[PDB]
Structure formats: C-alpha cells, structure tokens
C-alpha cells in the first residue's frame, strides 16, 4: 500500500542549514537582518532571495568547513517545496516588536490583532491549534536566477538560469526552476486570488481556516466548532471577506520569439501565473526572461477525457528581467562625474564625440558633427502664457545611391535610447498613429526617430510627419478616437533624390521631390552627393579594407568613445539649459540679414533653397544653444553661434563641387 523509497536528500537538517543561512551572515551587519526587518517594519513586502548568496554561503560552509548538504542544486531541483519551507524559517528569526508597529495604521491588521487579543483573552480565561502561519505574512518570497558573473566559481552544470527556448522546454523540467524568454501574449488583467478566507460562525463563534490548495476548493458549512456542534444543533457559518488574505493574481501566455522557431512548426505559447508584488510588472509585446518554478495545476475536470492525468502545466512567475529597460533621469552625478571626466579633460569634446558617432563608416565628419547635436538637442522654451517652441533638431540626409547614409541611422538608433528605426512601406500610416484595441512616433518619443526610403512613404504618412514638426502633437479624429496624443519625437530622415541620382542639369528642388512646406521645417539638410575622386577614394578603400580586415577601425591615433559612457556624457549634457548673451544675439541677427540677402541676391533657380524662412533663424539659435551645451555653457559664446552658421552653410553648398 503506497511503497516508500529513501532518498539521499533530507529536508530536516536542510531547514537547519537554511536557519544558519538566515541571520547568520557576513559577506554582505548582515543583509538578511536588515532586509527582513524592513519588511517587519511594513514598508516592504517582496523578499527577493538571490541564489547567488546561497552559492556564496556553501564556500564558507565547505572548504572552509564544516562541510554540509547542498542547496543550490537541491532548490532548483524542487523549488516549490522551498517556498513552503525555506520561507517559513523567516518566521522563527523575525524581530518581534519590531518598531512602532501599532495597529491602525493598517487596515485588516486590526482585525487579526483583535482576533489574537480576544483569542488570548478567552483562552486564558477558559484554561483558568492556532492561526496558520500562512495567514500572517504580508510578504512574498521570490527566488532569482543565477546567470551568473560569480557562477564561474565554478559549479558549472548548476545553472538553470539557462535562458532556454520554449521549444527546449520538456516534461522533465516540471517542478524545477527554469528561465524562459519570449514575447508577452494576451497579458490577462489582474484579479484577486484567495488564501484563507476563515469563515465566521454564528452562535459560539471561534474561527476555522480552510486551506486554499491547488486551483480550487470546496466550501464547507456544517459546523467545525465543538460548541455550536450537537448543542443545539449545528451553528451556521459564513465567510468574512475582510478577514481573508488576498494575493494578487495575474495570468499571461508567452509565445516564442519566432527566431527560436525552426524552419518548420509553429510558435508555441506558455501560460504563466503571477503573484504578489511581481504583478503588473509584465506588459504586452515585451521580450522578457521570466524565471519561475514550472508546474501543473490539475485537473478541474473533465477528468474523463484525460486519462491521464495529462497535466498541461503552466509557469509560476518568480523573478522578472525584461530586455531593454535612460536619461534624462538620474539624480547623481556621484563619482559618475568621474566617468564623465576622462572624456572632458582631454578637451575638444565636441570633435571627439562627433567622430565617435558611427566610426564604422569613413568620412562625413560634418554629418556626424551635427548628429551629436541631434542626440543632445534642447533647450526648447516656454513663453509663460504659455505655448512651446521646439525644442529639438530635425535632420535630413539626401543623396544616392551609396555613401552609406542609412548606416548612420542604424548607428544613431542603436546609440540613443528611445530610438526607433522604421521605413516607409515599411511602417504603415497606422504604424505611426495609435489604434484603439501607438507605434513609431508615439512608441519613440522624447528620443530620436529614424526614417529610410523617405520618398516612398506616399501621402498620408507625410501629413503626419509634416504636422509633427509643430511637435507636441498628432490629432486623430477617426472613428473611435478623438484623442490628441503627445509626440516629443525627433526626426532624422534619409531620402534619395529624384531618379536616378541628383541630375546637375536640374535645379535643386527639382531633384529633391519634396515640397517646400516640409523642408522649411528641417533645420539641417545634409545632401550627400558623390563625385568620384582618385585621391580620396583610395583612403576610403583603405578604410573599408582595413575593416573588414580588422574589427577595430581607428589606429594611430584616436580613441573611439564607447556608446555607454558617451550616453552618460550626453545625459549629463541635457541637464544644463544655457542662455544667450547679448553679443552673440546681435551677431546672429546681422549674419542672418547677410545670409538672407546673399541667398536672395543669388536669384531664382538652381542654387537656393530659399527663402531662409524664420525657422532657419530659430533653427540656428537652437543649434547654437545646442553647441553651448557641450561646452556645458550657460554663457553661449560667439564662437558657438558662428559655428552653427558654419554647420548650416556646410550642409548645403556641397552642390558646387
């Protein structure tokens, strides 16, 4: 009748080892005293248990004796049992008072407080078997995976924590913690679950707590209480909702990333249950490594069909790590400034960073020179009434077929956070606008958006983008949408001149197919035209041969600035908000008259674009005010503005070559 066979693993002394793991600690007073007391202090609920430290402890308990039984393998081997075992130990070592706990304060804590008060009183009076340990918690234990940088100890095969394919998943991983990855599907909305739910009786009272086990339970009436029982006759009892302990519950299915799908078959989703604090952490469409115990929840019946028992399972969520979590938000600027300073001290930050954007390609130091500004942006303005004036830079890159214009855009959208790369046919009109059930512009805003094949985008798209240079706007009046959403987006647009390539016998604006209503919005239009040159193309060929041949391009001598620290610098740049001095202002004005007059004295056709509409002025003030910020400024000196004019005139005027 149900045979038994011993196993080398024993939970008795392992619990002891857990107790020695908790509250007795050194390496990080100890972390398990403070981390526990902050929960006891009731500002904190989630208890994040790292398996990394469990790994650290065994070293001290082995080599370095005295030797003990292993957990890290024994945990993930089971990992369900430890939630009811490893976590109950916390009850034995927890600080009792702990500090300033009171009663109300908290809702529902007063209920149980009065429960134990009336229970203590009435029991101590009667004597003149206790409320379950799971009802009194108000905290959740969550294990986390060991990737790990310190997993190299090495325990080798100990890691799962193996960011595995949904296909890789087997029936041999049930009851064993497994990380998985994929896109969130259907992300069902949160509903309360249940744990105890102690119903209330009537006549003689007391309480009884029915365990919520598996998926469901059967409700009971009768009477459990001996007093109401048999005399006279059976006391009636109802469930009290205030007394019950509720744990948030949210379920969501996750399909595979589809790159992990073979040449054949089909994407296979996996159902994932969420509890406690981790709730709402998950959002639809987001690739995430979700780790958790892998479990069945049978069967609810049916029960005829399978037969058997055919578990069908699900994944309990434990920890959540999402891919792709950001300036401008950081407080400090503590010793991180140090990480900025290696970049500052060398001086000539502007050229250095400039070159450091997309070094992967050769030439066009001007283009990059400006793209640095694009990434930086600022400063906008508020007129106090108020209305806004952007606020950011809008770049175009013209010319064809080669010159590798789009690689700069993969570059930027790689470097800048909140960057998004799209193409015309490509990203549909419904791609940029937001449906009711956004993308592109809304999806990427407060950061740079990137466009390719900017000609082929047809019409409805061009109206969106034509409008978004009023910034702060899209307006969708269609059907179920009256909203006006806010897009703070920056735009960079790579486009090809009218076929085939830039016919010089045609005037500008002829070989640029784009209307003048739109171009007035663009502050900087870089037209990249290609005329074969024997000297330079040698240098180029040397570059593109050198890499491939090597991966690292610059040598003898330059130091390419890593994108991470670079993003840090730019982050520290965006914080400044500089202001113009009187002298640079006047200079801007005078130079603007000279630029207007010289542009128009040129005459109609070819040359151009006119008219140098005020958006070019405001544009050059805004570029000025950008260049200032890499000086970190607040001064906004004359050489800044002059430099802005330089970038502007150099943009075009390359059509004379």
């Amino acid at each position: 009748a149900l045979p038994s066979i011993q196993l080398p693993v024993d939970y008795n002394n392992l619990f002891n080892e857990i107790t020695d793991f908790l509250v007795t600690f050194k390496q990080d007073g100890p972390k398990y005293m403070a981390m526990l007391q902050k929960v006891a202090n009731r500002e904190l609920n989630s208890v994040i248990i790292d398996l990394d430290d469990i790994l650290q402890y065994q070293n001290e308990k082995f080599l370095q004796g005295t030797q003990a039984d292993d957990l890290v393998s024994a945990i993930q081997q089971n990992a369900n049992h430890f939630t009811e075992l490893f976590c109950r130990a916390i009850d034995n070592n927890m600080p009792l008072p702990t500090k300033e706990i009171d009663y109300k304060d908290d809702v529902l804590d007063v209920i149980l407080n009065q429960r134990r008060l009336r229970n203590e009183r009435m029991l101590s009076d009667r004597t003149n078997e206790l409320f379950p340990p799971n009802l009194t918690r108000r905290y959740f234990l969550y294990f986390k995976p060991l990737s790990q940088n310190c997993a190299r100890r090495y325990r080798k095969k100990a890691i799962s924590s193996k960011p595995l394919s949904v296909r890789q998943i087997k029936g041999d991983f049930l009851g064993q913690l497994i990380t998985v990855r994929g896109i969130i599907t259907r992300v069902s909305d949160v509903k309360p679950a249940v744990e105890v739910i102690a119903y209330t009786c009537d006549q003689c009272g007391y309480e009884v707590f029915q365990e919520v086990n598996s998926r469901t339970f059967t409700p009971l009436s009768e009477c459990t209480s001996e007093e109401c029982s048999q005399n006279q006759t059976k006391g009636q009892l109802f469930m009290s909702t205030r007394a019950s302990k509720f744990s948030a519950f949210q379920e969501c299915k996750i399909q595979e990333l589809s790159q992990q799908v073979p040449v054949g078959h089909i994407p296979r989703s996996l159902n994932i249950h969420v509890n406690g604090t981790l709730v709402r952490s998950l959002s639809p469409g987001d690739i995430v490594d979700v780790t958790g115990i892998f479990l069945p929840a049978p069967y609810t019946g049916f029960k005829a069909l399978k037969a058997g028992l055919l578990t069908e399972t699900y994944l309990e969520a434990q920890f959540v790590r999402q891919h792709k979590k950001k300036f401008a938000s950081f407080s400090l600027t503590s010793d991180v400034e140090e990480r900025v300073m290696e970049l500052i001290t060398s001086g000539d930050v502007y050229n250095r960073l400039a070159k450091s954007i997309a070094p992967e390609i050769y030439g066009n130091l001007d283009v990059k020179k400006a793209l640095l500004l694009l990434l930086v942006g600022g400063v906008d303005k508020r007129v106090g009434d108020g209305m806004k004036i952007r606020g950011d830079i809008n770049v175009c890159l013209m010319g064809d077929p080669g010159v590798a214009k789009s690689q700069l855009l993969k570059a930027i959208c790689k470097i800048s956070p909140r960057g998004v790369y799209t193409t015309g046919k490509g990203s549909s009109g419904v791609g940029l606008t937001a449906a009711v059930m956004g993308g592109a512009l809304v999806l990427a805003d407060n950061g740079i958006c990137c466009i390719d094949e900017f000609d082929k985008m047809d019409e409805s798209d061009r109206t969106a983008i034509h409008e978004v240079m009023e910034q702060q706007t899209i307006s969708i009046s269609k059907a179920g949408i009256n909203t006006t959403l806010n897009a703070r987006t920056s735009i960079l647009a790579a486009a090809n001149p009218l076929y085939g390539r830039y016919n010089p016998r045609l005037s500008p604006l002829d070989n640029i197919n784009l209307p003048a209503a739109l171009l007035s919005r663009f502050d900087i239009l870089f037209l990249m035209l290609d005329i074969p040159s024997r000297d330079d193309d040698e240098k180029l060929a040397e570059h593109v041969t050198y890499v491939h041949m090597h991966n690292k391009q610059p040598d003898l001598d330059f130091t390419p600035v890593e994108p991470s620290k670079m993003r840090e610098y730019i982050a520290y740049a965006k914080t400044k908000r500089p202001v113009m001095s009187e002298a640079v202002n006047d200079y801007v004005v005078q130079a603007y008259i000279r630029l207007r007059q010289d542009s128009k004295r040129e005459m109609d056709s070819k040359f151009s674009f006119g008219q140098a509409t005020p958006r070019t002025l405001l544009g050059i003030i805004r570029l000025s005010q950008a260049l200032a910020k890499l000086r970190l400024a607040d001064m906004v000196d004359i050489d800044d503005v002059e430099e802005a004019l330089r970038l502007v005139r150099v943009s075009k005027e390359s059509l004379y070559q």
């Binding site: 998004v420 046919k425 791609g431 041949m549």
Partner: protein, 314 residues
C-alpha cells in the same frame, strides 16, 4: 522509432578535401559540378558557390557589423532555367526556405500573432521566384532585411528587433515580354531603385537564338534523357566553419584600383555604382578565399572577384 526518409565527415572525407585544396584549378571544376543539366553559365554557378561561402561575418567592437553574405539576382527571358536553377540551389543549400512571388503574408515577419520565412531561414539561403511580382509593400521590408541584416517588429504588440541574417537569391522576369536583351540598361529591370543596389550581383542572361549553339544544346538535352555531387555539401560545411580567411594586404590595392576604375569609367558606361559595390568586392574576395581553404586572402582571389563582377557589369 520514426525514421524519416526522402554532417558526418569521418576520417577519410576531410582528408579528401585536404588533398583537393592544394590543386590550383579546383574552382572551375567545382563551379561545373553544380550543373549536370545546364549549359554554360559558368559565371553564374561560380556566383552561387560564392554565395554558399560568403565572406565570413564581421562584428566590430561597440559598433555595427558589416554584412558578410552575398545576394544575387537573375534576369532574362523565360527558359533561362532561372526557376530551374533555384531548386538545385535549394537542395544542396543546407536550408533554406523557398518563397515564390506572392507569397507572403509577412514573408519574414513574426506577424505578431493574435491572440516567418526570413527569420526561420537565418544562416541560410532564401530563394525568391518571380521576384518582380512581389508587392512593393514587402520590398520595403526586404530593404531592411538585406543590408541592415535585421528585422524590426513594432506591430502592436511585442516590440523587438530580431535577427534575420539570411543570404538571398532572386529570379525575376523582364518587364514586358522578351524585350530584355536589346532594351536599355535601365527601364529593363522594372524594380527601382535601391533594390538594384542591395543585390550584390545583377546577372543578365539572354535566350537569343543561334543554330550552332542550338545543336550544342540538342545533343546534351538528348543524352540527358538517357567529384560526386553529394560530396559538394560535405565539402562546403567544413569550409564554412573552418576557417575564416580574414584579410590581407596582398589584395587591397587590387580591389581599390578596380573599384575606382568601376566608378570612374562605368558611370560613363552604365549604372548603379556606390560604396556598396566596394563592400561586395571584399565579400567576394573573402568567399573565394574560403573556396581556396586559405587561412588568408590573396591577390589572385581579388582578381577573381574582379572577373565575376565584370561579367556582372559586362
């Protein structure tokens, strides 16, 4: 059990390769090994090999990666075997998925299923038949696939950039009727513009007829109805993961001379030519290096790349 029905190099095979690598003429034999049933087109076959190998892959430190693989297009009057060639591409290809015209939906996309090929074909050879017929809507995506080397899905939704690095072949009918042969260097292709560039090699084949060539067709066709080919893919895999030839200063000046020549003279002759062409030069050089099994790139290889890109152009 489940035995399916319709790689392992053992001791001996790898030795056969090793012996065979030294011989100087092997490339031509190999290039002939593809076509038991198909005349001539030695240049095109050469191409398909050079796609099977494909210029290693190079991912720079903290920077974008340059495209390794080579993409090919074939344009000519029907009966050119263009649709016949591709199946034989498919068989020995080691992957990948075939796609014919429309085709789609999403082609390579995940479609973000509520509530594709190019991804599933990663590290492989995608075929495209009737490449012209395909809706522009898709082409817009193919731009992103080919050079950029990645696919991006913002759809609803799961928002991710997932990688499809596939190599690509396409066969596409001439614009209208048989007119391809005489018709201008442009207006003949029918699918402007950047696409024309994205493809590393644009090969044109003519069905124009001659009596001599005809006879020479006749006999082989006849005999058809009445060194091993399988050794070809085994020859290929070891070549692929072993070993990447890197790059050498033997060659560079050659491809630079060549490239500059192309731009300067051909921009008078024909079109299109850009930095893209240069990239392609390097990929071809490295691929032919793989064919040679050489741990290094060489000048001879450079000359070969030169040759095929010439027959592409002329």
């Amino acid at each position: 059990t489940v035995y399916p029905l319709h790689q392992m190099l053992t001791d001996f095979d790898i030795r056969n390769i090793n012996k065979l690598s030294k011989k100087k003429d092997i490339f031509d034999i190999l290039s002939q090994s593809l076509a038991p049933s198909i005349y001539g087109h030695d240049h095109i076959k050469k191409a398909i090999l050079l796609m099977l190998m494909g210029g290693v892959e190079k991912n720079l430190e903290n920077g974008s990666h340059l495209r390794g693989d080579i993409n090919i297009l074939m344009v000519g009057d029907p009966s050119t075997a263009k649709s016949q060639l591709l199946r034989f591409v498919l068989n020995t290809a080691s992957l990948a998925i075939a796609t014919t015209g429309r085709g789609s939906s999403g082609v390579g996309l995940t479609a973000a299923v509520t509530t594709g090929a190019m991804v599933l074909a990663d590290r492989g050879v995608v075929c495209i038949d009737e490449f012209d017929k395909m809706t522009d809507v898709d082409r817009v995506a193919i731009h992103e696939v080919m050079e950029q080397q990645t696919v991006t899905i913002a759809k609803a939704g799961i928002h991710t950039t997932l990688n499809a690095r596939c190599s690509v072949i396409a066969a596409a009918n001439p614009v209208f009727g048989q007119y391809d042969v005489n018709r201008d260097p442009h207006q003949n292709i029918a699918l402007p513009d950047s696409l024309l560039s994205r493809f590393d090699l644009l090969f044109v084949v003519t069905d124009d007829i001659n009596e001599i060539r005809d006879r020479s067709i006749s006999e082989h066709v006849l005999r058809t109805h009445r060194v091993t080919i399988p050794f070809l893919r085994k020859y290929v895999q070891y070549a692929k993961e072993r070993v990447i030839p890197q790059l050498t200063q033997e060659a560079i000046n050659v491809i630079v001379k060549n490239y500059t020549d192309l731009r300067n003279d051909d921009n008078t002759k024909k079109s299109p030519i850009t930095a893209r062409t240069l990239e392609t030069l390097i990929r071809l050089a490295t691929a032919h290096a793989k064919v040679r099994l050489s741990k290094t790139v060489n000048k001879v290889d450079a000359k070969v790349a030169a040759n095929l890109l010439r027959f592409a152009l002329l």
